[PDB]
Point group: D2
């Protein structure tokens, strides 16, 4: 394949670091070596995260097209909209965000802390409810909007970012002098796992990318990942077809609903935070973290396996679930 064909606008510090989770690894039995690739610490633009790696491939088209306003959408505690708001300010562009009530949750400060709060400070026009109305709104005002779908996923360039991710991992394995056996990643809108599948199919490891569902609608998410992997594979000239076998999506850790954690989620967030000083959230990472932990605990990983946990970000959202953590 050839990813180099597509321009990348630098929004990050550079390749994200990989750290050993020795204490957690040891706590679970010392039979599986866990690591963490810090996608959550990739930028100075409002904490960044996985959506920021993605945006590096969309920005060029935005500029090439001469757009002056970035428009995106997501739930109230959306990490994506927050990142787009930061990226926007950094580039000198206006920003319109559609924030929808995607979660059956009602916290008193849910629409005033964490991610949404930062977006308002960052100067974005935050519209709480729509998509087309926002876009049209921009034209009618005399500006040219660049449409960024949820999580940047269902977009032509939306999976390029994480194809690069697999690239980076190969380069880093070279340095470490060893290859990771699996990769755990959280999936919801899909292009994160999609890009990984494509990139890792390149070396025969697409099926080693273990996606954990956090949408609680595994069928849709699975299909979207598959569809985007297929479009992205073509885009980058993957010398192969993405098969259903190439898309692994665990469905055991998404409950009870999207945006709502279960007792295991909370326990996972605590264990990880208490053994490594590494925080995860109640919506996404706490769920992928829970999945990985549970997998090791079940013996689902071959002894001696090196698993690379991809921490995609999302911590600011912790502020929207304050009461659940009042005593830790």
């Amino acid at each position: 394949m050839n990813l180099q064909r597509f321009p990348r606008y630098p929004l990050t510090f550079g390749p994200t670091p990989i750290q050993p989770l020795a204490r957690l690894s040891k706590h679970l039995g010392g039979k599986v070596h866990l690591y963490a690739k810090r996608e959550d610490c990739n930028s100075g633009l409002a904490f960044g995260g996985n959506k920021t790696r993605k945006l590096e491939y969309l920005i060029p088209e935005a500029l090439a097209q001469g757009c002056d306003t970035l428009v995106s959408i997501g739930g109230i505690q959306s990490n994506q909209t927050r990142q787009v708001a930061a990226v926007a300010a950094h580039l000198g562009m206006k920003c319109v965000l559609v924030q929808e009530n995607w979660v059956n949750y009602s916290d008193a400060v849910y629409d005033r802390v964490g991610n949404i709060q930062m977006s308002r400070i960052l100067g974005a026009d935050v519209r709480l409810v729509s998509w087309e109305d926002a876009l049209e709104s921009v034209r009618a005002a005399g500006g040219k909007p660049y449409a960024i779908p949820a999580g940047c996923s269902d977009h032509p360039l939306g999976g390029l970012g994480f194809v690069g991710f697999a690239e980076e991992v190969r380069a880093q394995e070279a340095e470490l002098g060893f290859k990771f056996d699996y990769v755990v990643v959280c999936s919801v809108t899909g292009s994160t796992q999609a890009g990984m599948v494509v990139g890792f199919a390149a070396d025969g490891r697409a099926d080693r990318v273990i996606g954990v569902d956090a949408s609680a609608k595994p069928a849709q998410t699975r299909e979207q990942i598959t569809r985007i992997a297929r479009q992205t594979a073509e885009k980058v000239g993957l010398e192969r077809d993405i098969m259903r076998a190439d898309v692994v999506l665990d469905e055991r850790f998404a409950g009870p609903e999207y945006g709502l954690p279960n007792e295991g989620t909370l326990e996972a967030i605590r264990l990880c935070a208490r053994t490594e000083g590494m925080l995860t959230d109640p919506v996404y990472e706490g769920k992928s973290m829970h999945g990985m932990i549970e997998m090791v605990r079940n013996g689902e990983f071959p002894e001696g396996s090196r698993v690379l946990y991809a921490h995609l970000g999302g911590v600011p959202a912790l502020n929207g679930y304050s009461f659940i953590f009042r005593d830790g």
Copy 2:
């Protein structure tokens, strides 16, 4: 000087990057070139920040002495206490925090969001004083069978507490080498003092100690200024600075600290928004929003020589934003 003499436990990713703030620079008139050194993005341990750089030099002593528990203190939204609980967890050490009511502020979720929230998740035993707690906590650890390492507010009034930022100066010189030029000034928020202290010492090494413009956030200028000078001198002796820190070496602007510690004025808010909206770089209403305020105001007043290159140190503190949600409800 010789800083390499003291061991440093890795808690950060490595040197913190310097980024130009061209939009904000241009916004103000294009006469002063503004930059930022991101100490706020120095670690994967619960967002880190300036206190984390400092802790790199206290930990080795904590481990050497075989302590099994880190104990510290700060106000409700303290950044220090959170970093201490992250570092603790990472190190396999227990953690006890004394959170006090240092701010005349009363937000509904003040003690349940931001920094303190993370601390509890991190496993620290977070103790809220009513409404001697310090020695009470230290002893509670001993009486429990452990050995506590005492970390004073901000790590500031501690022998090793200023080493962290002498190294900061070290880092900037090496970076100036690559950049091929030297920064004319540096802006740093100051409250308990060893951050500025370390900078004054480290920059005194090349005669730029007076170029470090401290911006007070304690609203108690005199005390803070004094503590900075005292920690600077103690530290200078610790590293073998080939000079003595003069009172003139400690600069501290008292204009942007109001109205009180932990409370922002309208300038602070304006500053926060302006920087946020022009660079996508967030700052808090307690510390950084004030230093940013000071810098912006300095540039706007022509107090900086035209053509000057001013390096703003972003110390962190953004999570505290959650404790002031209403003020930012409409942005």
Copy 3:
């Protein structure tokens, strides 16, 4: 029947008023005439409510046994614990409250507004337990009572809602009494009565009281517990124990206890879209507010009933407003735009 046998300590202002809900009635078709008996406005003791009516009969005992501390229990936004705390300060007694989280709910200011906020200002010792503690499993109840004694005081035990307590059903039999006296003036009788039911003695007392004139099965209870079976049984149990206590010249039949299960979802403490619509409609047509936990659900019940035609044309339904409005503060996000 003889209720006058038991002493009643004044905690209320006196009989609670009945007001016509003319706009709501007209809005629903004008075919059923809805009224409301304001138990929610029965006292100066921290907003009172149905639980304050019941306490009038328990206090005399607590004082006669010379208890110096009232001890009770309830969820975080329990109305019961708040009224106990007020009544207690008013009488010069100490107060210990065991509060656990009985609701799968997690609002940022849940344990610091509304009812619990008042109990703390009222001087009660509010004992909360972190999630997973299980007061029911550990027995925070008995630990509280013992702690009071160990401290040198004498506690008077008041169970959840006063319901499963010998004197607990007395209060609302008096309610039926009041309603007949008031019906005399009105020159007519209410065909039904809608009341919200959770721990039981409110409807229970009403059943006893109204059985005395053959209207027991006219008391339509709406379940807000989401555990209709247990609730129904406790009502029936409390009603029988209470009937015997007041000398009801009858046996309470399974048919005398009506409990509608259609408006309790999805869980105790959690409202449905219907609950919210009922709250807003009643509020916007009468200036009368109800909560997401209790009243909003009975109100939903009554409205849904009228709209369904389950009420005979011309019927006059008497809605008992038990109180609980303060709990609204625990559900701010839900009402952020109305």
Copy 4:
């Protein structure tokens, strides 16, 4: 005087009850007999309060003029705006409220709990910010006819009637009680509450016995408003006398530090009063008038044997906006 001249639309349950605060009284020395008139429990309309008594005399005009919308104003945690939203709903009228930030305070749920939350549930159109004129005009431009209700109903012709009536009630109740109250403590900010009391008690020569406790932190301005509204009101009811400045007593000692912000004494008073009587007061108004009355008794400023009547004007729901301050009681 003749108050019966003006029509009063029933919005309350009837005369408000008076209760003895025997515990509080004994706690403070037992040398002064404290009582309370529960204006805070006057109506089934969203908790009511003193503003509801005032509204009883404005509604007739509103209806007589055929207005279909009630428009009022006040701070975020305004009691008045809540009471107007409830009254409107009850009357079948639309409601528009101008909520302004009159308090230097910034709690996370300040604009989502207590009074303002109820107003939104009651169906009023709650506008957070010429704001006043803009609302009135938007109503007209919409095809409706708005009835303008100024802050607290105070600077309004009919605004002072409601509490002249309060004095009437007290006289009637003193009759039954077989005795008269020597003083009356009332909280004052916009003014028509104490103003009306001054007029109505002027009738029996007790106007200087109505002790107003300022909660505005701008006593001069508040004192002048009371005096001003009292005079205009006295003329409207035909008081057989003119209201002198000595007729208006306003203590400035307990309004600090600002309007809407309580001091340590406020909090203490709120607790002492709640813990001895089971009667709650808020940190904006009543907690300050309560603070005042307690400090007065504790300082001996009341002659031994006096019977002081505390007017509880309401406002408890505002408590929800100051949650952190009471987290531990």
